[PDB]
Symmetry: none
C-alpha cells in the first residue's frame, strides 16, 4: 500500500528489444551493485505525438553511460510492436534504430507494481531513478504529454549521485531565493 | 490505484496563513475555481535549510498570476509551523512567508497522497491539481536535492497551454500515412 | 460454462475502421440487425505472415452478402492497428483493409471470451454470433495454422440455413 | 481458464471398439504415442442424421496414417452405442463403424471439456490433443451443421508440419 | 432422511407414451386422482432380458382396475426408449409396450428417489405413491432378480385396504 | 446416495439372544461367514403384527439352510425385548424366539439404514447383506401390511442363484 | 446455563394415565392450575426393583393435598409403559399405578432437562415446577439409590411455605 | 452440552479461608484417590437469609470425616468477606468459627463450570458429591433457601459409598 | 482507545444509599444536572484500612458545594456493602457513610471503565465526569496508597474554572 | 484491559538529552536499575505556558534522590524538541532543561499507553513504572490543569514505602 520511494524498487523481469534489434530479457536484479537504473514509462508506440523524449534520450546515451546509468524505456506494447516502431523511419512516424533497450510490459504487471498504469490500459509518462543498492530515489509521474528535458534528468542524477556521498548541501545565498 | 490523471484525494487541514492566523483549508474550496500546487516536506526545524520554501515564496506572485494556490505541507502541528515562521532565517527558520502551511497532524494527507515514509514523515513531493480537481503532475524525492521554481513554472505553463514539454521534436519526424 | 448456444459476452472497444478513422464498436449495436464474426489473433507486427486477415478482407463482400459484420481483435492499441495497415505487405504489414479491427487494450474481451493466454495475448479464435446475440460456433487454435475463409462461409450458410429450416438431410 | 494450449483434462471411459468388443479407454494410454481426435455429439438414435460420424469413419485410414486415434463420445451407455451400430443407416443407425465410441455415462468428460449443455447431453465438438497431451485445437458447434473431414486432416497436417 | 411415509419427491420428465409419441409427465398430474407405481431399471439395450417390463405391461389392466399409473424410468434418453420399443423382442427389445417410459437424462429423479448407483445408472426399484402423494412402499434390488406382478398387486391391495380399514396385519 | 450395491453401514448393538441372555452383535462378525437378513420394526408391546416376528422364527431352519443370520431390530431397549419374549402370546408377547433381537436404543442403526421415521421409531424394513458385506436388497414399508416368509426366501434364493450363475 | 429459577423447558408427550388409557400431556396445561413434580428414570422392565415408583404412588393423595401433578418419565414408548403396568410386581412390573407416565420416545424431554446419558436413557432425576412454570428444585442421581417420599413432601412444603411467607429461620 | 452427572467433575482452583482462619488455596485434584468431596454453593454472605445450613453442616463435620468426605463451601464472595462473616457472631447473623473450608469463586468461573451461576452474578444453592475417581454421583440445585438436613445428606453419601463397593441392592 | 475527553461509558448498578436502603443508580440520571466523581476500590473487608472512603465522606459537603455526586464502587454485592457499613470503624469497617456505594457484582462497570484486574477485582481509581457526560480526569493506582481529598477538590475546581474561562 | 499493575508497554524512542544531543531511549534499559516517571503532553510551542515541564526540571534532584528517571513525551519530532529548548522562556520556550524529551513521531507510544486523542496528539498524562517494569500509577487529564511536583513526589514516596512496609493504617 505505501510508496516504494526510498524503499527497494519493485522487482521486474521483462522481454526486451536491444539496440542491435535482438530480443532478450531484462530483470532489475542484474543491475544491483553494478549500475544505476533510469526506468522511464510512456503510454504507447505509433501515436500521432512525436516521440521526442525517446529520440532525445537516445541522443544523450553517452551522458547516461558516463553516469553509470542503464536507460530503460517501457510501455505496455509487445516486443514485436517496439521492433516495428524501430524499423519504421522517423519520416514515416517511427523512432529509428535507438541504441538503448525497450521493455515490453505486455501483462501490464510492471506498470501496476510501479503505480503508473492508467485505466488498466496504458502506463502514464513516468521516470523512476533506482540507485546501485536497488533503492528508488526519485519518481516523476505526468499525465498530459509532459514532457521532460534531458538536461533536467541529467542534473537530477548528478544531484542524487552527489547527495549519496556528501549529503545535504546548503546552497549559497539560499536566503535570497 | 494511482490518482495521477484521476481526481485528487480530498484533504482538510488546520493551517497557518501568511498573516500568522490559524484557520482551515480543504480541497473543495479550489475545485472548479483554482489550480493547486501542493508541496510536501518532512519536518520543520531540521538541519536542512529551508531553501525550497523560500524559493517558492519568492515566486508566489508568479503562481498567483497563473491562478495557482501554493500550499505547503508537513506532519508537524500548526503551533510548530507558527514557531518556525517566528524564527528568523539567520537562526534556521523560515520567517514570515506569505503562502499557507498545512498541518498534517494525523498523517492522513501524506497517507492519501502516497508520500508518507515509515509511518512518520512525508517525503519531499509536489502535486499539481488542475481547476477540475484532476492531478496532472506528481514529483517524489527521497533526498533534499531541490527543484527549480523555473522548472515548476514551465510545467504549469505547459499544462495551461496544452502545449508539449521537453526537447525539440526532430525536423525529419512526420506521422505515418497510407500508400 | 461455455457461452456456446448462450448469449455472447458483451464488449465495448476502441476500433480502426476501413477509412482509418477511430471509433467505438459495441456488441449491442448489432443485436436484431446483423450476424457478427468476431475473430481473435495474438499480435500485430509478428514474424508470422498475416495471410488470414488479408484472406478475410478479400472476402468482405461475401460476408456482407450474408449480413455478417467481420470484426478482428487483438490486445494491441488502435494506434498499432493503424500503423500495421500503413505498413506494406512486403514488410509483413496487412495493407488498407476495409474491415474493422478492435483494440482489446484492457484484455477484458479476450478474458470474457476465454481466449486470453498467459494474461498477455489472445489465442487465434473465431466466434459467430447470430442476430439474437447467441453464439452458434466457436473455434480456438493454439498454433499459427490459419482457417479457410471458404469454411467460415460454409459454416455461416449452414447455421443460417438451419436457423430457418431446422436439421433434416 | 481455457485448456487450449494446456494439458487436456484426463478422461477414462467404457467403450465400444470397432469390432463391437467392450473395453475401457483413458487419456494416459495415448500420451507419448498417439495424437487424439476426441469428438462429441449429443445423442444416439435421434432424427438428426449421423452423417458426420459416417464421414469420419470413411476417413479412418487417413487418421491412422497420421498416428491419430479417433474417439467419438456421447452421454449414452455403451449398450446404446452397440445397439446403434447394430441398426442400419436406412433405419436411422450408424452401422458397423470401425472407430471407437466412448460412454460418458456420468457426464464428467462433457463437464471437464466444458461441452455439457444443461446437465443432460453435450454439444457438437472436436478436440485435437497432441502426443504430449496438449490441446492444440477446439471447435464447438451449437447446431448440426457438420465439419469437413478435409479441414480436420489439414489442421492435423499443420500441427504435424512445424 | 427417508421420504417413505412422507411426501414423494417431485419429478418432471420427458416421456415416450404407448403410441410412441413424445411428451412430458409430472408428479402433480396424478395427485388426488391416481396412485403411482414408479419403477426404475438401469439401462435399455442390455444383455439382461426385459422380462419385468414385459410382465408389468401384460398386467397393465390389473393396475388400471386399482387406479394406479405404471411409469417406467431409466437414465436413457427418450430416443433410446423409442429405439428400444421399435426393436423386436427376438433382437433384445421391449416391443410396443402400452405403459409410459420416463427419461431421467439429467439423473435428478434417480438422485431424489435414492436409487442412483455410482453417479451413472439407477438400481432396479419400485415406489408406490398414494393419492395424497405419500410414498407407502419402496423396494430396491441390486441384481436382476425380478419381481412377481402378483406380489406387486398384493402390496397395492394391502396398501389400499390399510389406508381406509385400519393398519393391522394378519396372523 | 444409497448403500444398496455398496458396503452395508456398520452397527455394533446390544442384543437379546435366543437363550434369553444379553450380549453384543456387530456387522463385522458375519463377513465371509454368513448372509445377514436384518429386519426393522417400530415398537415392541403393540398389538400390530407380533405375528411377523413369530412367523420369521418359525422359518429359522429355512434361514439357516441358506446360511442366513436373522436379526430383528427396534429402538426399544434390550430389557423391553426380553420382557416381550417373557410375555405370553395371548397377551401380545412374541414368546421364546431363537433368533436375535438388536436394541437400537440410540436410534443410530435406523438412522444409518435410512429407516428412522420422525426421529422416533423405525419403519418396517428388510435388508439382505451378502457374505462380502454388500447390501443386495432393501425393502421399506410405511404400513403394517406384513411380508410372507415365502416371499423373503424366494428373494434370498434368487440372489444366491444370481451370485453363483450370473443373470440368465 | 441452568433452568433452575427460570421457566421450565416446554414438553408435549404421549402418556399412559392411571386408568391405563392413552393420551397427551403438555407443560402449559398446569400453568396457573397446579405444581408439577416431574421425575425421570432410565428404563422399564429392568432388574432394578421399581421401589421409588411404587413408593411415590402410595403417597399420591399427599401429592394431591399439595396441588401437585406427579409425572413419571422415561425414553420408553407408551406401549412399553402400559405393558409394565400390566405386569405384576412379582414378575418385575409396577402394577396399576394411579399416576401418569410420559413417553420420551424422541429423547427430547431428557435432552431439554439435561438428564440424558450417552444419547440413550435418562439419569434418575426430580424437577419441581411452580404454578408460574418456574423450576424451584432439581435433583439428579447417577445411581439407583432412591429418594424418601417424606423428603420430597418436606421440600414441596418448604417451597409453598416460602412463596407465602418468604424467608424465615431456623433450622 | 450434556450434564457432568456420571462424568468427571469440572476442575476448580480457588483461594480459600480454612477452618483455622488462614488464607490458602484448594484444587479438585488434591482429593482424587484420597477423598470424596461434598461441594456446596450458596449465593452470598451477609444476606437477610440466615445461615442455618452452614451451621448445621459444621456441627456434623465429624460424620463427614468418618466417611472420608471433604466438606467445601463456595460462593462468589472474596476470601476477606468469608473471614469477616466467620468473625461476625451468630447473634448478628454470622457463621462464627466454622471448621470447614470456604472457597472464594471471585471470577465466577467455578459456578459457571458447575452450571449454578445466576444472571452472571451469584450462584444458586447447590450440592455436588464427587467420588474418589473424580466422578459426580449426585447434584441437588435449589432456587430458594429451603435447607437440607445433614441426616439426608449422610444417608445419600452412605448409599453412594455402599453402591460403589457392593453394587445394586434392593431395599428390604 | 481511552474514554478521557469523550463520553463516559454508561453504567447501571444496585446501590446502598446513606439511609442503608438498597436501590439503583445509572449514569443518565446525572447528565445535564451534575458532575460525578466515580471512584473504584477492589474489595470490602480487606486488611487495608478504609481511610480513603471515610475521608471522602467527611468532605461530602465540599463535594455538594461544587455540584458533584460522589459514588463509590466495588465488585462486592450490596449485602457486603451494607454489612461493612454495619461494621464499626474500630473493627475495620466504614460505618454509616452518607454517600452512595455501587455494587459491580457482574464486574461490567470495572470492565467498561478499564479498571478490572485479572477478571476478579477493580484497581483503585477515580473518574471525574462533567455535566455533559465527558470524562475530564482519570487516576488509577495499583497500590493501597491513598489520595488526599484536598488534591481531589483542587482538581474539580481547576476543571470547573477551565470550563468557565479556559487555560 | 489496562496495563496498570502489569508490565509497562515497551517503547524505543528518539530523544533530546539535557546536553541538547540526540539519541535513543529504550524502556528495557531501566529495568532492575531505575524507577521511570514517563509523562505525556500534547504539543510544543502552544499558547499554554509550559510551567509543568519547567517545574519538573527545577525539581530534578528530587527525582534523582528517589532513583526515578524523568522522561517527557510528545508526538513532535526531536527537531521541534531541540528548537523549543533553544527558545527563551519569554518567547514561549522551555529553555535548556536537564531531563530527556522523547519523540513519539509515529504516535505508537501514545497509542500503547492509551493516551492518544483523535489519532493526533497525546493527552496530559503521568505514568510511574517500577524497578521490575510494572506500572503502579497512571494519571490522565483532558485539560491543562497542571499537577504540583509535591503531589508527584508524595506518590513516588508512598509507592516506595509500600514496597518496604505495607499499607499504613492511619491517614
Amino acid at each position: 500500500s505505501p510508496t516504494y520511494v526510498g524503499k527497494e524498487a519493485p522487482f521486474f523481469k521483462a522481454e526486451a528489444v536491444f539496440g542491435d534489434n535482438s530480443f532478450g530479457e531484462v530483470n532489475l536484479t542484474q543491475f544491483i551493485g553494478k549500475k544505476y537504473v533510469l526506468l522511464y514509462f510512456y503510454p504507447l508506440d505509433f501515436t500521432f505525438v512525436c516521440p521526442s523524449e525517446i529520440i532525445a534520450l537516445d541522443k544523450a546515451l553517452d551522458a547516461f553511460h558516463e553516469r553509470n546509468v542503464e536507460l530503460l524505456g517501457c510501455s505496455v506494447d509487445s516486443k514485436y510492436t517496439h521492433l516495428a516502431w524501430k524499423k519504421t523511419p522517423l519520416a514515416k512516424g517511427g523512432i529509428g534504430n535507438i541504441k538503448h533497450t525497450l521493455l515490453s510490459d505486455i501483462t501490464k504487471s510492471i506498470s501496476k507494481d510501479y503505480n503508473v498504469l492508467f485505466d488498466d490500459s496504458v502506463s502514464l509518462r513516468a521516470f523512476v531513478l533506482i540507485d546501485m543498492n536497488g533503492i528508488v530515489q526519485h519518481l516523476l509521474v505526468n499525465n498530459l504529454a509532459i514532457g521532460r528535458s534531458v538536461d533536467e534528468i541529467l542534473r537530477i542524477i548528478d544531484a542524487i549521485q552527489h547527495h549519496e556521498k556528501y549529503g545535504d548541501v546548503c546552497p549559497a545565498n539560499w536566503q535570497k531565493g
